[PDB]
């Protein structure tokens, strides 16, 4: 429970990026009213507040919510920060509103399936022409070569050497229950782990017509990249940014080159390793979904071709 | 699954330790059998084998088994390590050993229980006088003042200097979360957290007589100590050492104040933190039990008196 939120603010890329979007949105914000997605324990909303919001409705259908409360009337913003228990879908506001907020990314973006809220909230509540916060997101594609997991598999066929033991046997083992699974597994990567340049396959303007079809229907793009040197090849990772409007925008990276962030990155390893060399081709497709039983689970379907080798498909879902 | 052996053979305070526990004993190895209870991948039951044992068996009850069967080929040991599924209590080995030795220590040392099959097989198994290794085990309580679940609470009142929020209220509601609960929590600490001198509160001679009805019943003793300094108490930790008999035995500690294993301690955390000075008097009293459900699962039983407060008591179990 209380773990996601320490980790939430003690996250500095998303706690900063949110407080100067909002802040860079001063004239839109100023004198006007904002719904607040999923407010959690409303610091999203007292941003807003601070960048000169009149009014601003939090909404939050966690238990949290009872300490959003508290932290309005902390700042002494009870007279116009309210905060209103429950989902969106069905919250009643006295007004609709010149903008909303949310922080509403999941792991691999859309784990969690929340964009649909703030979605029906902007249909719902949200005046013509009134803004979005952030208003759009990208994710992005890159071939990796993960250096732990090539630590963790290959140390099996080191430990004759450190401890006099040969345990090779164990790297195949290793190397079927770590890669040979079909789930997303969420872990932070570096500049280290990227083995071409990352490809930007989709773009979302989340006010966009037609977006909540897209998301039932699956959300991608093709992709095609160069390898920049001999490795082993271990799958894919999948991140995404976010970029608040201005006058040059504001744009918060989960990207493995840039600052780490509690969403991390989402891996999808192949069952094996594919030795690569430089510019060794690959081109793929990848597709994010809902899971079948229930939407708020991230399914990634995967298709691959790494240089001569056949297009492969690989199906996962969210660890 | 995986995750556990790799960490196991990463910590090369276990692996080392049990390399030349076992390597210590060459002169009662030499020519003997051993029975290497709970032998997971195999590693000590190839030590025992390099050692000069003339045979070994290895008894493994989980699927892991026949990676311990592979090790041992690709080692060349086919013809004296003999790797044998199921548990230990059904086994049938062609004759009684020389030697136990086994990795039976769990997270706060008995979680998993598993110490009741090594005394299992040394009834069954092990030859009048045998050699069981480790040979004894001994458990440490100290009051601790964790600096990273202080800092964790206290950086909600920190928001206001860090991003311009006062969140000060979510310190209590953290501290409900993380202290409030009654689970054993799983952590590693250092040096810094300690509160006073840790305290030994039970020696377990592993060949002793009634030790596995002593587990039944409960395992501990008393303790008192005095605090180094002013801190927030936030509770007690409890860690374990192993020694192997030799002529200096080889001491296999999991304390704060020694190099990290992947043990680390069990921590019982108070309800919310108690100031505390230099000098405060602690006393109190630690009793390790098997849950009523399930042996397998560690309860701990913790009585405690802080200077002039009244006595407390706190029941835990394993998370
Ligand atoms: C890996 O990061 C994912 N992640 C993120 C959060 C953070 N959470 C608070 C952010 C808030 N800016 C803050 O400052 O606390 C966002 C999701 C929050 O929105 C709530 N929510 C969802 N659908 C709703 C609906 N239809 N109507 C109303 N509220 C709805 C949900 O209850 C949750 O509290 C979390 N808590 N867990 C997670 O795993
Ligand atoms: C926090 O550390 C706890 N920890 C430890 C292990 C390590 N494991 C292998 C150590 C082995 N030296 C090696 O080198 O791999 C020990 C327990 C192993 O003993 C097996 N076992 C238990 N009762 C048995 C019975 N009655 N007869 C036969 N085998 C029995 C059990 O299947 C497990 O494999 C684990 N695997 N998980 C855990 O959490």
Redesign the pocket.
């Known amino acids: 429970d209380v773990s996601?939120?320490e980790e939430?603010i003690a996250d500095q890329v998303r706690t900063e990026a949110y407080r100067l979007g909002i802040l860079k949105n001063w004239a839109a914000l100023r004198g006007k009213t904002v719904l607040?997605?999923?407010?959690?324990?409303?610091?999203?909303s007292i941003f807003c507040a601070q960048a000169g919001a009149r009014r601003v409705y939090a909404?939050?259908?966690?238990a949290?919510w009872q300490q959003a409360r508290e932290v309005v009337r902390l700042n002494g913003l009870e007279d116009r920060v309210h905060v209103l228990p429950?989902?969106?879908?069905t919250v009643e506001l006295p007004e609709r509103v010149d903008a909303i907020v949310?922080?509403?990314?999941?792991?691999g973006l859309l784990h969690?399936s929340?964009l649909s809220?703030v979605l029906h909230a902007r249909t719902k509540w949200l005046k013509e022409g009134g803004l979005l916060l952030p208003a759009s997101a990208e994710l992005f594609v890159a071939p990796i070569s993960d250096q732990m997991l090539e630590w963790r598999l290959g140390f099996w066929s080191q430990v004759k050497q450190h401890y006099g033991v040969d345990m090779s046997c164990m790297e195949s083992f290793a190397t079927r229950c770590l890669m040979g699974h079909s789930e997303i597994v969420v872990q932070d990567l570096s500049g280290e782990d990227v083995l071409a340049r990352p490809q930007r396959f989709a773009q979302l303007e989340l006010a966009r017509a037609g977006l909540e079809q897209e998301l039932e229907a699956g959300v991608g793009g093709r992709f095609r990249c160069s390898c920049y040197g001999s490795a082993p090849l271990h799958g894919f990772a999948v991140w995404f940014q976010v970029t608040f409007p201005g006058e040059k925008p504001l744009v918060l990276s989960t990207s493995p080159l840039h600052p780490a962030t509690?969403?991390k990155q989402a891996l999808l390893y192949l069952n094996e390793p594919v030795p690569v060399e430089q510019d060794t081709d690959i081109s793929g497709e990848i597709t994010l979904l809902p899971s079948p039983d229930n939407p708020r689970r991230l399914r990634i379907l995967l298709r691959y071709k790494v240089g001569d080798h056949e297009e492969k498909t690989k199906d996962f879902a969210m660890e």
Chains 1, 2 share one sequence.
Do not use: K, N
Not at 36 to 44: H, W, Y
Not at 86 to 89: D, I, N
Not at 102 to 107: F, P, R
């Open positions: 996601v939120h939430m607040d997605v999923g407010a959690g324990t409303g610091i999203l909404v939050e259908a966690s949290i429950g989902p969106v879908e949310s922080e509403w990314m999941g792991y969690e929340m809220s509690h969403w």
